[PDB]
Amino acid sequence: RAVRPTKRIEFTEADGDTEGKSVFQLEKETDKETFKIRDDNPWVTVETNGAVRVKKKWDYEELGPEKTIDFWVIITNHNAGIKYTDNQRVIILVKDVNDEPPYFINRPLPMQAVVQLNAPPNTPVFTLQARDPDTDHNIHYFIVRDRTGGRFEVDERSGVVRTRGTDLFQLDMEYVLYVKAEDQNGKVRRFQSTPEERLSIVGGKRAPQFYMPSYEAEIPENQKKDSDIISIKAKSFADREIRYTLKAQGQGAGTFNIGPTSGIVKLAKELDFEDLRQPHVYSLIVTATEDSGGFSTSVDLTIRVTDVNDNAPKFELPDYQAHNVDEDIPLGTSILRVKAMDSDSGSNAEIEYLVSDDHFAVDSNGIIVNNKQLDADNNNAYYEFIVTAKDKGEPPKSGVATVRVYTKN
Numbered sequence: 521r522a523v524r525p526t527k528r529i530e531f532t533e534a535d536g537d538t539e540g541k542s543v544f545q546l547e548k549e550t551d552k553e554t555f556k557i558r559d560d561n562p563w564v565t566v567e568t569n570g571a572v573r574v575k576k577k578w579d580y581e582e583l584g585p586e587k588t589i590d591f592w593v594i595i596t597n598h599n600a601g602i603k604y605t606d607n608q609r610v611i612i613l614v615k616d617v618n619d620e621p622p623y624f625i626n627r628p629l630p631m632q633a634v635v636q637l638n639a640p641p642n643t644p645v646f647t648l649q650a651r652d653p654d655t656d657h658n659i660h661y662f663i664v665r666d667r668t669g670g671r672f673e674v675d676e677r678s679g680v681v682r683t684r685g686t687d688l689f690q691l692d693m694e695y696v697l698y699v700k701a702e703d704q705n706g707k708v709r710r711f712q713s714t715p716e717e718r719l720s721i722v723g724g725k726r727a728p729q730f731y732m733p734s735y736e737a738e739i740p741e742n743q744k745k746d747s748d749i750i751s752i753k754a755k756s757f758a759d760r761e762i763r764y765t766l767k768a769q770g771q772g773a774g775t776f777n778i779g780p781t782s783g784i785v786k787l788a789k790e791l792d793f794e795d796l797r798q799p800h801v802y803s804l805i806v807t808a809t810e811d812s813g814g815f816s817t818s819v820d821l822t823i824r825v826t827d828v829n830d831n832a833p834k835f836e837l838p839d840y841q842a843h844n845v846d847e848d849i850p851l852g853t854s855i856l857r858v859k860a861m862d863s864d865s866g867s868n869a870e871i872e873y874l875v876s877d878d879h880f881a882v883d884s885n886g887i888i889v890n891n892k893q894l895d896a897d898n899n900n901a902y903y904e905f906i907v908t909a910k911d912k913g914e915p916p917k918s919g920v921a922t923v924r925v926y927t928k929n
């Protein structure tokens with residue numbers, strides 16, 4: 521059994537573009553020998569005949585600096601005379617292909633700017649910025665569709681949008697441009713491209729814009745007061761300072777509040793998933809107002825509260841007692857029924873039953889049964905033991921109750 525010289529081979533990304541594709545064949549030294557990969561590899565699998573097949577679609581952008589798929593292969597070989605189990609290393613060099621589309625990095629989205637009312641021609645107003653994962657990208661900027669009527673133009677390389685013409689812009693009017701960025705070093709004979717984006721240019725002045733079109737957060741019911749839930753941030757287009765406020769529709773306001781200037785949302789009142797009067801989903805409205813101006817804008821903020829196993833199963837009675845039980849009762853007789861309830865939900869409310877005295881047994885329905893003869897070793901004619909109701913929470917909480925069984929002959 522020997523190490524064989526390393527196999528070196530070269531391919532482009534695209535060659536490995538189809539899951540399961542047999543890209544190439546490993547070299548055999550006799551017909552009879554078979555192949556198996558030495559360890560998992562994310563990019564390739566190996567058939568017993570030597571075929572190297574794509575596992576995960578090959579990706580230059582996701583390989584390390586070496587840009588190789590590097591793996592070992594076991595080669596095995598009765599009736600052939602000489603037996604062995606060989607090792608060979610296999611190194612595929614992966615060449616780049618322009619295969620990933622460009623994407624805008626402008627934030628926030630949608631894209632928004634303002635234009636000064638009497639802006640001279642060629643005033644810069646916005647700067648489109650795209651990025652492209654491929655090594656040899658070639659980003660070109662375009663206005664694909666104009667709804668200003670021709671009052672703007674973009675520089676194809678810098679992505680700067682600037683005014684055209686001398687006419688004034690109208691206060692509060694929106695001027696709309698649909699823009700794209702494309703990578704001209706890659707195609708599909710059609711160039712790789714961002715989705716069309718809507719660039720909103722408003723004359724003179726506009727309301728603030730939040731950094732996200734909406735906000736959401738899922739928090740547990742047991743999370744402490746005054747703790748930070750989510751922080752919200754808006755931008756002014758005239759560099760005014762901003763102050764936030766919050767509302768509800770129409771379930772439980774006062775539960776949350778917001779930081780005056782810093783936008784951080786905190787928990788104000790302790791929560792309870794078990795409290796019906798509080799909802800499980802909190803629909804909130806956050807408005808960012810310019811108190812140095814007048815303008816303001818709203819954004820939805822949704823908070824989901826989750827169940828924690830804060831409740832233990834409770835038995836309906838504090839203790840259970842059965843009387844006049846004949847001791848000769850055949851095994852399997854219902855002696856008494858027991859029941860316990862749990863406030864939580866799902867499996868935090870799922871209930872299993874146990875019994876501390878192996879003379880009895882109990883099923884998922886709480887039926888306490890006779891598990892051994894009751895007439896043997898029972899001088900005082902009486903059993904006293906504990907039932908547990910145990911939930912399926914993590915960790916599980918328990919409820920317990922005394923059970924008394926008085927027997928007789």
Ligand SMILES: [Ca+2]
Pocket residue numbers: 533578579580581582619620
């Ligand atoms: Ca790729």
Ligand SMILES: [Ca+2]
Pocket residue numbers: 533580581616617618619620653654655
């Ligand atoms: Ca590529």
Ligand SMILES: [Ca+2]
Pocket residue numbers: 618619620621622652653654657703706712
């Ligand atoms: Ca590209």
Ligand SMILES: [Ca+2]
Pocket residue numbers: 741791792793794795830
């Ligand atoms: Ca609770």
Ligand SMILES: [Ca+2]
Pocket residue numbers: 829830831832833862863864868869911913917
């Ligand atoms: Ca529980």
Ligand SMILES: [Ca+2]
Pocket residue numbers: 741793794827828829830831863864865
């Ligand atoms: Ca709970």
